[PDB]
Design a protein around this ligand. Structure first.
Ligand SMILES: [Cl-]
Ligand SMILES: [Cl-]
Ligand SMILES: [Cl-]
Ligand SMILES: [Cl-]
Ligand SMILES: [Cl-]
Ligand code: NA
Ligand code: NA
Lengths: 229, 229, 226, 226
């Protein structure tokens, strides 16, 4: 029915699974708990940070126990411990000072041996590149008016995402992509109401995407803590 | 709508147009004249070779004048002159000895300065790679039962196509791809009956395909005559 | 050995050859005539526009006859004809208003049926991408301090180059790349002094680059009048 | 220097590191122990299977304690445990019935939760594609006479390697590549003796190769039990 929640969310969890560390999980920007519900299958100790009281309240009404909720902007958040897994998915592109957020993650929140799961929408996704060729988007890394209205301040590609992670002091351990994406979201949502594409086709786009990270819907950096003093 | 006739044929002509030489044209394997109809817009002197007397007669009914029709197998064909442009589109994959056919083109049929437009379906098309990931097709360069039934003896990729052209003595001048293809024909044929995709989307697939020749529906080598004695 | 002059120049002429129109040719930013010497093998009617008096003087004393020299800035150039082939190679990335120059080319200088051969250094060249992974360059389309000191005001990729061409009103007919480049120029200049790489290897890099336009040393748009 | 030993080995361990399971490790086709010595930094409980008496003897001489050595062919090997990590690196391409070896791994040797690190030389490596363009090698997935003399029976790419792992009953969890490789081993060995390329350049090739798995020196499937 819905591309981001019914297709992308499940494949994002699948992409993270082989890298998850045992222990606890911090979900930054957990919004209404839609992704949290999927992570609860893997983690019994999840902390969620979200600035919207309303989103957080919605989450709290639909998730199982074992979640610690923190209603705060990231700059103001005082967390009680450090975390073995941290999830920052489709959040960084909303942040005015992304390097500062990533640096907090590296310096304050990641446990020793902990891993950051950094995922952003990808400037070089096939569907976007086609939109650029059609002249609907000026260029790949452009921020469209709709994206700006949604809160985006940039459109990452693997090059600029790893730059920001490196500038923050993180160690980028793995680079990958999630879901080979040749149609726009609005076309997916139409086509998914039909029997034209199978579940197996969607799995094939996930499998093939790993071979063409630069062309995927979302790009994925697995990062570990770097030493900063 | 039909993908091959309504989408691929016009993009093939667009892909050829910047390279056409002044003079005449030989269309090898012209079948029922579906492609010949588009070539007529560019050339007044066209020669078609085709083994099926029914196809050739079908073509003769529908096309305009200014076509010389040669009813023959390629190995038997005795042509009255040499040709400034030679078109071999979706034919070589059907040939038991493709190097021998290409060698005839080089040695007997290409005029001095003439160009061969060699186009084959691509083993590495994104849609085919997805089918391979789904387990429908064993590997990219496999020939499926249905393909074999249609007459295919090979599934070329840029490496194996250039190999055969080189072995035939041709000079490969340009390598490219036609149409960034991430859906199968059967899905195109369904979706093209909807309004999900626009004509501009399809144009975008053609534009982007040029930047990713290996992932296109068909691959295209522009070849010139080499010296063989 | 120079990578740009001894490797990139011949491969650019090879990439252009199948697209050349019969007729005349205009070379915009012809500098000291290094690339003009190679174009002279294909055309006997060449017009060269160059702003540097020393450069164009140097070309003049070095090239064969059949050349019209125009010592002018592009904004001031009064050309006597329009042109069947126009070459703009490693110039656009220096231009403060690149769309304005491309528009002049579309609207005034290209002949009907004419072709523009637009080539720029590629942000996404493998060598550059590696430099970016090393932390030497911030990101692919960055302009470094050295590049800026050389006059670069942007680092094009296929997306931004076609954007600017399209904004100028040109028709982008073909998109390609010239030379699969995994080493930096300075490493090439060194390595070319040795016997490690062959001329066949270099030809192979050219042939392979056509299959990976986004990863090449230079990107190449073939444009026609919109 | 050696390219395979001094460059590829360390970058294979790096590629593996984020996927390693706690516990033990089985190295299939451990030869003279060059890769094993690197694995010893990560695991104290390693089991090595190697058919050559000379090779396995050499390894015992040069490695630390905490290695179990199994001098056997794969078809005869009777292993004492099942394993959390199994390494099969540059071996499968030599095996007459590769699906049968992968099935043994899936059905008998992998522990539940265990991971197979399957790595083969890549048909579509840039250097190899250049060699194909030069006419030295017929096509990317060919086996050359020299390769065949060295025991190669195929040249895998991502599509065929995943096909074979899938046919064996393995779950292919991740697909990646190791080292963006645009020069031939023999060119690397020469250039490595010079100062033209730094270790940071080589790290850059590793980092970039993850973004272009199909162009890498070797391809890497991380598999689990199906
Ligand atoms: Cl800085
Ligand atoms: Cl073949
Ligand atoms: Cl005109
Ligand atoms: Cl600057
Ligand atoms: Cl077990
Ligand atoms: Na300027
Ligand atoms: Na064998």
């Amino acid at each position: 029915y819905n591309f981001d929640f019914d297709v992308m969310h499940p494949f994002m969890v699948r992409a993270f699974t082989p890298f998850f560390r045992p222990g606890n999980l911090l979900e930054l920007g957990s919004f209404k708990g839609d992704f949290t519900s999927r992570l609860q299958e893997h983690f019994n100790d999840i902390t969620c940070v979200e600035a919207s009281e309303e989103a957080i309240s919605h989450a709290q009404g639909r998730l199982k126990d074992g979640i610690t909720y923190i209603h705060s902007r990231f700059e103001d958040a005082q967390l009680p411990r450090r975390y073995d897994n941290i999830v920052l998915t489709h959040v960084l592109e909303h942040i005015d000072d992304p390097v500062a957020l990533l640096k907090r993650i590296n310096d304050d929140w990641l446990a020793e041996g902990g891993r950051l799961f950094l995922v952003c929408p990808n400037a070089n996704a096939v569907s976007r590149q086609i939109a650029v060729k059609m002249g609907i988007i000026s260029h790949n890394s452009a921020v469209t008016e709709a994206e700006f209205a949604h809160g985006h301040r940039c459109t990452y590609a693997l090059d600029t995402l790893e730059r920001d992670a490196s500038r923050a002091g993180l160690q980028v351990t793995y680079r990958s992509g999630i879901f080979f994406k040749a149609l726009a979201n609005f076309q997916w949502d139409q086509i998914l109401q039909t029997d034209i594409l199978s579940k197996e086709y969607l799995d094939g786009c996930y499998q093939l995407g790993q071979q063409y990270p630069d062309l995927c819907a979302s790009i994925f950096l697995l990062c570990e803590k770097g030493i900063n003093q």
